[PDB]
Symmetry: C6
Subunit: 250 residues, 6 copies
Amino acid sequence: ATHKPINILEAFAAAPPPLDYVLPNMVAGTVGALVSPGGAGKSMLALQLAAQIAGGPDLLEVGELPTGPVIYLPAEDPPTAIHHRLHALGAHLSAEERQAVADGLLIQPLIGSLPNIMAPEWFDGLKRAAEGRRLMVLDTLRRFHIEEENASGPMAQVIGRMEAIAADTGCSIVFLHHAVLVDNIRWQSYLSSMTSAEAEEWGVDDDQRRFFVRFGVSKANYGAPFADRWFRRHDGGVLKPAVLERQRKS
Amino acid sequence: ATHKPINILEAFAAAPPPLDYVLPNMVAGTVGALVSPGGAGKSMLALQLAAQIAGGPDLLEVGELPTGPVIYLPAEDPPTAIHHRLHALGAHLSAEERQAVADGLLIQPLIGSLPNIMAPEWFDGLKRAAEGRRLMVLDTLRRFHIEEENASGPMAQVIGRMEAIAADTGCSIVFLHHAVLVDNIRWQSYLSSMTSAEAEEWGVDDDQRRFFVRFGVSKANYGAPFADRWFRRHDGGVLKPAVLERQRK
Amino acid sequence: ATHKPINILEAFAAAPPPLDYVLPNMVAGTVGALVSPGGAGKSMLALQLAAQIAGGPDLLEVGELPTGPVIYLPAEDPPTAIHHRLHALGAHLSAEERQAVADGLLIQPLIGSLPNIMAPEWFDGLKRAAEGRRLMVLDTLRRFHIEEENASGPMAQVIGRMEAIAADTGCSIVFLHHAVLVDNIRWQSYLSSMTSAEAEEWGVDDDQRRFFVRFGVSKANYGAPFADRWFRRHDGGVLKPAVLERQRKS
Amino acid sequence: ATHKPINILEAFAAAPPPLDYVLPNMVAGTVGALVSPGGAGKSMLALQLAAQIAGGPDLLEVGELPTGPVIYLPAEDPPTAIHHRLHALGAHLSAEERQAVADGLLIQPLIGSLPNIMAPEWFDGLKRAAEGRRLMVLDTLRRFHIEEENASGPMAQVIGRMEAIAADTGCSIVFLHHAVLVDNIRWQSYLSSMTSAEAEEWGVDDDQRRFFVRFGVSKANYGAPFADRWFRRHDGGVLKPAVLERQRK
Amino acid sequence: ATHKPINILEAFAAAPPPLDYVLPNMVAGTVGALVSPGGAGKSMLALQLAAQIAGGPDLLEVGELPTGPVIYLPAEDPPTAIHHRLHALGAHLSAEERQAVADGLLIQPLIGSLPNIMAPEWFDGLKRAAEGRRLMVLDTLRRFHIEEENASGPMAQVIGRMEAIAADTGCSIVFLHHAVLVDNIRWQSYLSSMTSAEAEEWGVDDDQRRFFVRFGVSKANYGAPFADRWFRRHDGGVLKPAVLERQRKS
Amino acid sequence: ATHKPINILEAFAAAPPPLDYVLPNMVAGTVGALVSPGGAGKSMLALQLAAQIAGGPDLLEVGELPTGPVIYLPAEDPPTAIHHRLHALGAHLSAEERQAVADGLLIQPLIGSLPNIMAPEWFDGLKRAAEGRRLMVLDTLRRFHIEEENASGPMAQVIGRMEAIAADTGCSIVFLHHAVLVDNIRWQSYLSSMTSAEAEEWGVDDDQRRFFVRFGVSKANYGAPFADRWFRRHDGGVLKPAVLERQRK
C-alpha cells in the first residue's frame, strides 16, 4: 500500500537476490489466479497446494515451495465436502505431514456468508485474516464480490483491493475463478479436464479421460518455463502425476 | 451462516460420515440448478423428485433418496395446471404413497405474487419457509428476482441469497431455469427433448420422439458417476424410465 | 396474486378436471403472446378471436372456445380504422352473432393515451378493466410500457404485472408484439405472411402471396398439438381458412 | 387523447365513411416514417408532399391527396439551403400554385434550436403548432430528441409523444429518419438511390444512376396496394416521375 | 438558434441565389467533419484549408474559396509542433500571402486545457471565439467533450451545440475526428494514406506510399461531385497535388 | 495549461528551434503510449529508456536522447521484482553510468497503492511529481484509474488529465498498456514477441524465439522515420540489439 522510493544505487550494488516464488512462477506478495471450468478440480488442487505450503509433501511434484501459514477460504463448498477432501488427502500423508498441515493451514468455510471485498468491514476482515499468513486462497472469487466480472473498472477495484492486502501483509493471494480478470493479473494458472481429442493422443480410453487433468501456468513474468503436467485423479479426487505414453501418430 | 474453522486433525484421523446427497451428486444444504428449454418437462421432473424426497416411491428409478419435508414453489403455472400435474402423478400412487407425499410436500403457488429474493420481506419469507425442510424448489428462478439474468453481479447477489438460506437452514435449494447463472452453481442437471438425430439413434419413430426426454447431471463435484437416463412421458406428462434399444450404423 | 397451499390429497382424489383453454393451448388466467412482423394481421386476427370469445362464430376454424366478456385495447390504430375492420367482419356475421359480439366485446381505443403498466394509476386502471372479463387483448405491448424490451429484468416486471392481473381477476391477458419476452411467457402464437419460397410450394402465384398468412402456436405447455393453419385475407383483411393444395416437388 | 368506446352495432350496421388518408396508405391523425440513407432525397420528397397536401399540384403523380394546412420543420438544413430547395420547386409552379402552397404551408426552420420533444416546453410548443393542421413533418427525428435511437424504451416515449400530439389535434406526423424506430411505426415509406444493379435492370447508364431514386411504402395496414415509383431528380433535386423501360436477361 | 418562418412566396419569387460553400460542398453556417486514422495528415490539411480561407493560396487546388477570419483550435499538438507546420507551410507562401494569413488566422492552442462543450462556460467561450469568424476548426473533437462517441444521444447533444453556435454566429464549424458521428452530420470529408494495394496501382513503389494521401468528400447534400484527389506530402508534411499515372492492368 | 495565441508572422519568418523529442518521434511535453501483450517486455524496455533519458548509456541503440530527470511509477510489480530488473540492468553499467542513472531516475513503487488520476489527491500528487521532470512513466495505465478502458468518454477524461499534467509541467508522460485508448494518443510504440513465422523469417530456431522481441513506433506525427528494431533478451530480461540475418523463400 505505501512505499519508499527504490534506492537505485543499492539495487545495482546489492547481489542478485533470488525471487521468492509463492507458487511456481508466482512472485510472493502479489495476486494470482487459478482458472478453469467448474468441476475441473480447482478446489482439490488448491487444497493440495495450500497443504503443501503449510508444510505437507509435494504430492503434485510441482517442485519444493517455501513454507508458511496458509488460509484457505472456501465459499462454495459446505464443510462436509471439505472434510471428505481432507480425509482423502490424509491417506497420502504420514502422521508428521498431517500434523504439519494441521499446524500450518487454517480453513475457514464461508458458504452462505456473503463476503464482499468492496464493503469496508469485509475488506478489513480479509485483511486481518491475511495477516501472518504466507498464502491466502479465495475459492472462488465470484463469491467475494458483487461486481460485473466482465467490467474492467469494477474488476480493477476488486483486484486492487487484493493487491493492497497482499502488498501490506506480504500474504500472497490466489483466487480461483470458474471459466478481463486475466488482463488485470500477472500470474495465471489453469486446469483442463482431458478432452476426447487429448484422450485419443495420450492413448487413454474415452471412458477413462475423466480421470486426468492438465495443469499449467498460462501467464507469468518471471522464472524457468513451467511444463504442462498431467494429473491422475485418485480417490476423493486427490491429484498426483500421471504416467502417460503419448501418441506419435504413425 | 457462521462456520467454525475446519478441524483438520480430526478430518484426517477418522472417516467422516458419508456425504448426504439430497439429489444424485448434490450435497444437502447447497444450491443446484435444473435446466432445460421451456416445455421440456422441468415442472414434472421437479414435482416427481420433490414427491420422492417427501416420501413417495422412486418412479424415476434414480435410486433411493433420503426423505424429509419438501416445499415446492411454482410461480408460473396456475393452480389449475398444478392440480392436473398432481392428479396425473397421483394415478401412479397407492393410498399409502399419496399419504406419504402429502405429509412431506408443501406446494405454495406463487403465480402473480411476484416474489423478489432481493427484497427483505421475501428474503425473510423464503428463509422461514426453508426452516426445518430438506428441499426447496423454485420454479423458475426467473420469477424470484427482477435482475438481468446475464448480469453476473446481480446474479451473484441472487444466488448468494439462496446460498445463505441453504446454509443457515440446512434446506437445499434447486431452482429451475429456462435455457452465467450456471457457471457459478456447483450442481447442474438438465432435461433435453429427444431430437430427430437421437430418435434415429434409439430406433424411435420421429412422430414419437416428443414422448421422450433425456435427463442428466452435467456438473457436480467429484463423486459416483450418474448415467444419463431416458424417460417416457406418460399421460399428463408423468415421467418413467424409457425402454429403448441402442442402434448402430 | 395470493394463494393457499395446494391441498395435495384432494388433488390426487378429485377427478381429472379438463384444463380450461382461453385460446388453443393457452391456460385461462395467464398471460400469452401473439407475435409477428408489423403488418402481418395481428390486429385482425386478435379482433376475430376477441369477437369469437365474446360469442361470435369460429370463422377461423381454430375450434370452439368458451365464451365470456372480452376487452380489446388497441393503442396503435385510430378509431376509424377499428370501424373499418369491424364493418368488414360484420359482413360475415348474422344479425344474432353481431348482437352477441356487441353485448360481449368492449373496445376501448388508447391511441395517444400513453398507458404505462409500471405507473400505479395505469396498473390499477388496467386491473379494473380486466375485472369481469374473460379476455383482455393489448395491441401491442410496446405501447403499454416504456422499458427496454430486450432487458429481461424490466420485462419480468412488466410481464409480472400482467400475470398479477390475470391471476387475481381470472381475466387471461394476451398481448400482441411486433417482431426475451418469449422466454418470459408460457404461451406463444405467431402469424407469418406467405414468403416467396412458401408461395412456390403451396402453388400460389407470387403476386397472390400477399393474400395468405400462416398461424401457429410456437410455444405452449399443455394440450393436443395445434396444426399450423393457412388463412386467406378477404376484404377489409378478414381471415378465413385457405384451401391450399401443396407442392410435392416431383 | 381520450376515446369513447367503439360502438360496435353501429360499426356493423352501416358502412363507415371512407378512411381518410393523409398520404398513400397512411390514415390521417397517425404517426408515420420516411426512411432513407442521408442524401437520398427525403427533404425534397417531403417538401414536395407537404406542398401537395398544402394545395399544390401533384408533381410526384402519387394521386390526388386531401388538402389542409401543413407545417414543415427542417432542423438540419440552414435557411439558405431551404430557399434553394423551394426556389427549384417554384420553377414547376404557376403563380396560382405558388399562392395555394404559400397559403397552406408553414416552414419553421429549427437548425441550431435543439428542439427536444421530451422537454415539456417543446412538447407543448409542437402540440400548439399541430393544432388545426393536417400534416406535421419532422426533418429529421434525430434532431427532436436526445435519446439513444436503438434504445426501445426511450424511443417508445418519443414516439408516444408524437402519437399523443397526432391523436389530440388530428394532425398527422411524418418524421424522416436517416438509415427499432421502425418496428413500432404503423406506416413506413422509403427512398432508395438507384444502384448499379438497378441501373442495369432499367437500362440506365451507370454515370446516370445518381439522377434516379426509388420510392415506396414498405409498411402499412391493410388497404389499396401502392406501387413502387421511380423518380428523376431535376435541377435543385426536384423529383418527378421517371420514364424508364424494364429490361430482361 | 431562433428563426422566423420562411417567406414562401419570396423564396419562389427571389432569383436562384448561389449556395455559399465554406469548403467544397459544405454549406456555410453548418457543422462538418474531417475524418481519418490518426497520423494521416488531418492537422496539416486543416491548417492549409484554414490558411486558405484566411486569404492564403489554394495550394491544394480544391478550388477557390470565399475568404473570412478563421480560428484554428488545436487541442492535441503542442505549440512547437504548430510552429514547425507553419514554418514549413510558410516556404510555399509569398510575403503578401503570409501577411494575409497572419491577419486572417487565429490559432489558439488548447493542449491540456480540457475544453468541454457540455459545460456552460466552455460553451459560452467557444461561442465567443466563433463570433466574427467564418470558420472554426476543432482539432480533434475528442478533446472537446467527455461523452461516449458511440452513444447517439450524447453525441446529438455535443453536435447540436456546435450547430447552435454555427447557426447563431454564421461561423461554420469543422471538427476533425480520429477513425455514429457520421450519421449525426451532413458534410463529411476524409483522408486515407495510400495502401499497399493502392500503391501497386498508381504505380508508386511500396517504400514511397508514405508520401501520398487520398482526400475526398464522402458525404454532402449539395454541389457538383468532388473528385477524390491524391496529395504528395512535402517537407514538414505540406500537401500538394500529386502527379499520378495510374495502372490499367494489362 | 494556458497558451498564448500562435504568432504566425514570427513562425513563418524564422526557422523555429528544432523539435525537442523525448523519445524517438515523440515531442517533449506530450502523452504517448507503449503497448504490448502482458509479458512482452514493456517494464524492461521502459526502465531502460527511463535510465537512458536519466543519463545512462544507449544500450538499446535507439540514438542519443536529451537527458533530464525521469520518474518511473511501477504499480504492478513488487519492489523485489523491480530490484531484480534493476540489478540485471546494473550489470551492463560502469560505476559512472550507475551514478548518472541514480542521479536522474526516481522510481516510486505503487503496488497496492491504488493511485486514481480521477481523484483530486492523486491528480495533484502526480502533477507535483511531474514538476521539473522530463519523463514520467506509468506502468501500466490500468492501475492509475478505475474506469472502463473501452469507454471512450471516461478514457478521454483520464487521458485529458495526463495531457494537462504534461502541458502544465513540461514533463512528458508515457503510459504502458497491456493489449480506443490508442485512437486518440498521438505517439504509440509497441513491443511484439517474435512469432514462429518471424523466427523462420530471420532464421532463428523456434525453441529460441522467446529470446527475441520487436520494437517499433506505430503512430507518430510527421518526422524522421524510425525503423523497427529487434532486441535480444539477455539475463533478467535486459534488451539489447539483436544480430539477425534476413531470409528468403
